[PDB]
């Protein structure tokens, strides 16, 4: 049985975390719940940590007294089908293959599935690892409350005698880095030190080995990235948001001054020695939308090229860890900002950006989000129980599965089947645009050989690269957003429309320049 | 926000408490989750209580660190039919009010439902209280979380102003007694000698008048009632059961001596 | 009502059937239920035939005393989409008709419906018999017990006149031959000498105008294909099977010499004359993999051409009735045995194979068949029933209409769900890597014309042709077999992997040569 500690004596060193524990609802928990530090306690002086004291990242920690929280978070959603391949003809991108060659994502891009399964998820997928690691079995797949009891209790490592990233399987890639990781899980968070910069206090940077960093890794979302295990307070851990919003001076609401001021951030570092090392973002506010920005988001996580000269931005530079905290219409700038592109396009030879669900910065200036709506209000609605103590699910998952909290306590007007079919109409609506700005930029992608071929020239060629990187961004916003145009229809829409005309518009100056050499 | 106290300092006098609760799955669960005895620790002795700390009853002293069990607990089986008479040819005992003609239960005496209702349904029944107590109105009957909150939230009582037992309705009868209220509740457990024998520091007993024991009591079921607040172990705090299982050495199972 | 003959007559002269008959569980079951022998009696002799007795070969024969099976067979799964084209976005195979052109199933390839319509499905398709045969009317699609009282009862002739292949229908192909009934029917049983080679007791053979067998040919999946009528025992009766595992050595588990030697299969001819005529082979125990491998396997079953020279294969060579027998990384070896390739692709001119529905060689090795499962276990399981008599389930479909019997009892650890998800993931994996697979050989094919047209080798082209060999093989395994990867997904993932893999390699091969041409 757990046998608590004398805290007191802990804050005689502690008193940041004094200053936090004490005022907040997690006073009366005792240290010993996810800290075994008699060895450090024996050892230390205030300036001098001695035996390092272990700190559990484990869920469990939590659920011993948030089971309801814990239960809701690991359950599996089966009707969010698994490993289903975007790139097919009834999925997100019918032409993912052609308009994303080049880059890492054409080996393997799935649709999201549940949150239980998102490091392991993350470490078998075949652009991440080069086949390395996979299920023991093809029957683990569905064992959710085994992947958050740990990753390595689910999987196997093709190769535990070495540590380089390779193809196992040939048709894979290596595209895992250590930052990745800092979306999947912060087991790493007292380990890694802010940004992934070099430090001395930090085992792990963004230029570790990541094969290294995985085996250290074992559970996915951690319950302490949104809440301080200490004050029990609402935050975010996530580096690049915090850089985002404070250092970079840009808000948790960009576009809202008034509600950034209201629904704000603290950050707060902690030091190794004399030095900054870690940091977290306390929020003003319990906003599910900055919490689940932490990962919902558009950002760099891999290296890349700089767009003024083409020259490599690796893993070492800052740039690899971004958030761009930037919607579609402010992207190009935003990366024109740092100087930075992701791929060469294998078949065009245009720089491209390379985009990821940017949930958070699309749902900025919706309609719902202009009235104070947040992710969790559609996404882990608070419980409805006849007789019972209210709660909040963390099942996070789409609303069509809880419709009477999600939607319809707001919308009185509706029936359930009236509001999917207004979800419906919406996706239905930007489905059809994706699938019409796929099949022109697909169209203009074709012609770059046969221009090429037929003698057109480099400045035409970079000319219609120049369209084509356009003509992707609008594109490709939306099959990396994961609401089919629900977060911000309106724009999606116009987003759509002008890789459409982006398209078009170097598909006429590509057919008229082979046209004039034939012729 | 809750601030924990020193329990070290409680354990100098409450050694019985301390051997629990340091063993146990709750030696990391401070004082203050249960009792504010501030004023307590300021004037006891090891001998004498001094002031009288608060001790939470509640349920949902228990829910905020075990809401699965709470929430499954005060759920209501509406399939269970409430306020369902026995004496009925479609129920248990068609021809009870013959057979059982000169008993009180001939006033009333419904089948079981949920256990969140047990302190409220004894309170109303018509065989108990001369119908003194009543739900606030008719849609109460289905509010377990409210009844589990407190039986009067829920309930009111015809005449607060006396004490006595009497019929307030012409067909119900009085049966209601101290005893009867702990199989309802264990809110009175500090406040009741075993056995409901006389005693000096017992503000209820077996011969209390009824009424004012029922409105000094709020909870159904505590969660208590099975678990050890303190060491969180299993248990029982009936006295009746306590009373034949050990004083009368009958055991838990009395035909069988090695179970 | 049936009047039983004198058996033991019979017996005086059927020495074989005697000792088969006497033996099993059909002693006490008399010729009269599927013989009229009556003339024959009167006019034979031990040596002689006299009149030739007639021999039921309806379903109907066996229904009379096993009705459950019976009924179990001929229901029709409603929810198995009929007449459904594999070509389609919504299918098996997006891009089928340009990798498959210039074959016949370019015509149509639909997915698999219940067995009752096999022999009507054959009859109508677009690919088989020119459009000369239909359903008498659009409703009659329905009508499985129909189909299985016998296909004339419900199908229409174009030309009861004439009895040539040609098309009726401008868009239908004449690919029918008389190979193919063996997988459709085996009511020539009596009529066909084994393997279809000429033989002067065979009515029918592999050069027979196939149009005016089909007209003597009624019912599907005869009972009796998979156990012998005279003695129940289990069987298997098409020759190819037979030829495969027996004659040339293989074994009923080509991987595995133990398991061969305990579930093997004893050839068992009969003679016409003097001359052996035809065999079947009778099963060491009742093994669902090899009865069902008796159909559910890849084959020849056409006419092709040789390898070595490219000259054709007609349909009076034995090549013509083959079970390859192998694996998919045997298969080409064992292609190369017999010297044989089934098309040219119309585009790329390489020499081709037709691959088809490989289950049985598929499952090989597979974790289910190493664990001695096999394919009843799953698709047709015993029956439960709350009171009962047990008795196997004859209506051969997906686990996913009867998972209790056929997954759950077996994998207690799972739900229903948990079940489902797990073949999910395997089948969403798969037709990801299939899609990936065909988007890589579109691409090498449309490098061909542009290729040629640019003037690049023969020499460039024939290496490119012969990576299209293998690109094609390893690909079309998996849209041809029909478990889309569930049945051994490890290899379908190699396999597959594989493909893109060649592919990969003959889109630079021919990109690098016509950039060279320009450069
Ligand atoms: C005698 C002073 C002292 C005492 C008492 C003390 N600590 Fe520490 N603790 C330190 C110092 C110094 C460090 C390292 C700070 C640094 O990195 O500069 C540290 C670090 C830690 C860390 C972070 C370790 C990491 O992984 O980086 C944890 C967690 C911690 N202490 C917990 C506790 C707990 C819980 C107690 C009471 C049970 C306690 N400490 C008592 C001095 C103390
Ligand atoms: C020993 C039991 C215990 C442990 C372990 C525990 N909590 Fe708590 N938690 C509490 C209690 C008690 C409260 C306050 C309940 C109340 O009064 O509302 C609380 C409150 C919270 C709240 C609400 C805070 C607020 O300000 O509204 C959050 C969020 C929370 N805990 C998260 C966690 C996380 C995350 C973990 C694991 C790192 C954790 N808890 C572990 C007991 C625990
Ligand atoms: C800023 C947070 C963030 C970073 C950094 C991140 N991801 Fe993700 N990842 C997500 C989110 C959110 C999802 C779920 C939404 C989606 O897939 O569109 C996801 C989903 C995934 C999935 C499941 C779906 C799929 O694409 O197959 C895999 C695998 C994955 N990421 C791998 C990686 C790899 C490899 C890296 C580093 C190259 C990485 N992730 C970095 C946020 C992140
Ligand atoms: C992605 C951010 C996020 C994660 C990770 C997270 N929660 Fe929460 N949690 C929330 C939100 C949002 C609320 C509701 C805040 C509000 O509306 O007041 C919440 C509320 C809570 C509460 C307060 C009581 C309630 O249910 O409202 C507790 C306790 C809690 N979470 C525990 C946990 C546990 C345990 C885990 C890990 C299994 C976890 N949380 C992980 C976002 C998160
Ligand atoms: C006003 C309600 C609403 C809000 C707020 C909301 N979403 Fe959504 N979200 C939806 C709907 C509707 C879908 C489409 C779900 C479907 O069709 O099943 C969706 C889809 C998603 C999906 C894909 C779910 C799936 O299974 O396909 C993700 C991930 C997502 N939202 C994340 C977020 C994020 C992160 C936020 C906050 C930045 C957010 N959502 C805010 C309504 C909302
Ligand atoms: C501040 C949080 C907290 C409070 C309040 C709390 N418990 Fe617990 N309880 C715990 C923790 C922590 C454990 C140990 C969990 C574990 O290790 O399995 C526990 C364990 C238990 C157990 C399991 C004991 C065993 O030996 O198996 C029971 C029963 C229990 N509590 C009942 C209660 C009751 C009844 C109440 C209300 C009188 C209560 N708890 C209040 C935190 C709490
Ligand atoms: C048009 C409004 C309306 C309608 C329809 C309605 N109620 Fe009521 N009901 C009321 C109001 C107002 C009260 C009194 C609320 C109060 O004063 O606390 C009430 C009281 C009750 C009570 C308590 C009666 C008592 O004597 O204390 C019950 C039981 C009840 N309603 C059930 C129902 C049922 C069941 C239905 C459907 C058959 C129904 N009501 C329909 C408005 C309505
Ligand atoms: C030994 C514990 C015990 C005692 C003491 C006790 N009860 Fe009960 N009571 C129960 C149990 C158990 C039930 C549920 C089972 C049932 O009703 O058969 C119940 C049910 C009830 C009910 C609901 C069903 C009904 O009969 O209408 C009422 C009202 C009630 N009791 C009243 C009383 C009264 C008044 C007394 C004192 C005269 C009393 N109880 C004493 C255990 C007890
Ligand atoms: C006159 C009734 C009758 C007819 C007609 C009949 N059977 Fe049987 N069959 C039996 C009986 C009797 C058994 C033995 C039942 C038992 O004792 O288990 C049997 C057993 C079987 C068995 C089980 C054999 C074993 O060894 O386990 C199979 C398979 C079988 N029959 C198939 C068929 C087939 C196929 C046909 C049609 C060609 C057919 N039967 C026609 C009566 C019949
Ligand atoms: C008012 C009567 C009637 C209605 C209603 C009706 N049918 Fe028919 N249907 C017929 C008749 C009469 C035929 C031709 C029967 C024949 O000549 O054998 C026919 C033929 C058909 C055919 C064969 C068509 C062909 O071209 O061979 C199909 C398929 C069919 N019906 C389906 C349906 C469906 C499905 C519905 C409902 C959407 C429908 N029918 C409604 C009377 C009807
Ligand atoms: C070795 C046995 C075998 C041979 C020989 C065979 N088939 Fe099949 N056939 C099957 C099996 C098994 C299926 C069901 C699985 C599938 O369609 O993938 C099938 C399905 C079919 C279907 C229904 C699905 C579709 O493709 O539309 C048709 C039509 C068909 N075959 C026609 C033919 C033709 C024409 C021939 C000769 C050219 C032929 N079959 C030879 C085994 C065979
Ligand atoms: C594709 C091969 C196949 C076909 C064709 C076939 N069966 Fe079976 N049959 C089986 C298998 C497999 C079993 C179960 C053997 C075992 O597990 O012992 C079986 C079992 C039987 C039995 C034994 C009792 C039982 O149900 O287990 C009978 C009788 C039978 N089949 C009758 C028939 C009838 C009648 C037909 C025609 C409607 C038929 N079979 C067609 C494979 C076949
Ligand atoms: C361990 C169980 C298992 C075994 C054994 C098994 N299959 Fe399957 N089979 C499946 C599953 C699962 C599918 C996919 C069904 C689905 O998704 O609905 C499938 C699909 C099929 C299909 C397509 C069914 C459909 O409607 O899509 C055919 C045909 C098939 N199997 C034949 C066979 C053959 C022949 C064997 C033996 C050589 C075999 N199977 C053995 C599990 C099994
Ligand atoms: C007759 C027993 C049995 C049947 C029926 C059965 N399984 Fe299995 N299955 C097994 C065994 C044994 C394993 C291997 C277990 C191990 O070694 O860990 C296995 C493995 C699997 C695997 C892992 C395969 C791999 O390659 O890693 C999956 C997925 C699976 N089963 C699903 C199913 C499905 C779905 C069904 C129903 C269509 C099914 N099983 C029916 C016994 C069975
Ligand atoms: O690949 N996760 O953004
Ligand atoms: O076309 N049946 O293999
Ligand atoms: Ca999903
Ligand atoms: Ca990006
Ligand atoms: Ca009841
Ligand atoms: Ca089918
Ligand atoms: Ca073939
Ligand atoms: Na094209």
Known sequence: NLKPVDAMQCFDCHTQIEDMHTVGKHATVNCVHCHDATEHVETASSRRMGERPVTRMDLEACATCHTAQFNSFVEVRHESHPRLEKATPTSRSPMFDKLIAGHGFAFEHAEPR???????????????????????????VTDGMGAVRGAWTVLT??????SDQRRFLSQTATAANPVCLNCKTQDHILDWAYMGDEHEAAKWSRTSEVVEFARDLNHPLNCFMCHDPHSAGPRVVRDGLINAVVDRGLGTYPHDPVKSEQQGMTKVTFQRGREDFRAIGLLDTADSNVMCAQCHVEYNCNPGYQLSDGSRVGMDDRRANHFFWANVFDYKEAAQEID??????????????????????????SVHERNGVAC?????????????????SHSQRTPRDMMGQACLNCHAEWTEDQALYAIDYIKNYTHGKIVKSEYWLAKMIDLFPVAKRAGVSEDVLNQARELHYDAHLYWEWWTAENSVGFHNPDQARESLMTSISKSKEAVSLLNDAIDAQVA
């Open 114 to 140: 549940s949150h239980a399964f998102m490091l392991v998820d993350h470490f078998v997928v075949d652009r991440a690892y080069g086949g390395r690691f996979q299920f023991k079995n093809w029957q683990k």
């Open 157 to 162: 490592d093709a190769d535990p005698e070495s």
């Open 376 to 392: 969790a209000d559609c996404h882990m609605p608070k419980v409805q129980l006849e007789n019972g103590k209210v709660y909040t």
């Open 340 to 365: 930075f592109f992701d791929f060469r396009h294998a078949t065009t030879g245009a720089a491209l950006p390379k985009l990821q669900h940017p949930e958070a910065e699309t749902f900025w200036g």
